[PDB]
């Protein structure tokens, strides 16, 4: 079947959140980093890369603290420490 404007994405996946990256659920890494629209287009594609990617290497560190949940068509590139208290978070780690 013919199609146009096919976009590609790359994202490290543990393996058990593939069922949750789809709309209607949020995974361990799909709660704060990856997302899909309400009715995702295209198809789910995956293969095995644990043998070669793993050696560990924390370059692909997944975000865990942030302001809120994900909205469609957004990029989580802001690396700000979550402010869960009245005291400002400037000054590295705090309570």
């Amino acid at each position, epitope marked *: 079947l013919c199609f146009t404007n096919v976009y590609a994405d790359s994202f490290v996946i543990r393996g*058990d959140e593939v069922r949750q990256i789809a709309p209607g659920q949020t995974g361990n890494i799909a*709660d704060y980093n990856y997302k899909l629209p309400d009715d995702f287009t295209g198809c789910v594609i995956a293969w095995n890369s644990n043998k070669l990617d793993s050696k560990g290497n924390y370059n692909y560190l997944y975000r865990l603290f942030r302001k809120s*949940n994900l909205k469609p068509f957004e990029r989580d590139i802001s690396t700000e420490i979550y402010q869960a208290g009245n005291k400002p978070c400037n000054g590295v780690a705090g309570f």
Partner: nanobody
Amino acid sequence: QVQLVESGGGLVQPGGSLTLSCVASESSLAPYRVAWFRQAPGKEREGVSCISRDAHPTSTYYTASVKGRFTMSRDNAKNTVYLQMNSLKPSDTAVYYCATDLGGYCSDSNYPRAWWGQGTQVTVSS
């Protein structure tokens, strides 16, 4: 703005059982993770157990001291979490607090720590 009320604590003999109640008000805890904390006097806060919004055992965490003896259970149908707390040791004597945040899933190293209740006293002795 969410308010948590811990209850169910009291005096118990070693090996006994108790059920702690963390009543939430002014909000729904259903889409947010809820964790239990306890502090003994002189000792800092430490986690006890955490349950995610999905309430699966894989998303439910227990600390090493409580694994296999405490039971974490939440009722998102009626907005409350319960720590089923059995086979008591004197080392479990502490003020038990329940905590929640806007996070939806617990991790073994991350518990919700935004909003706290007044806590309940659990004492395991004669």
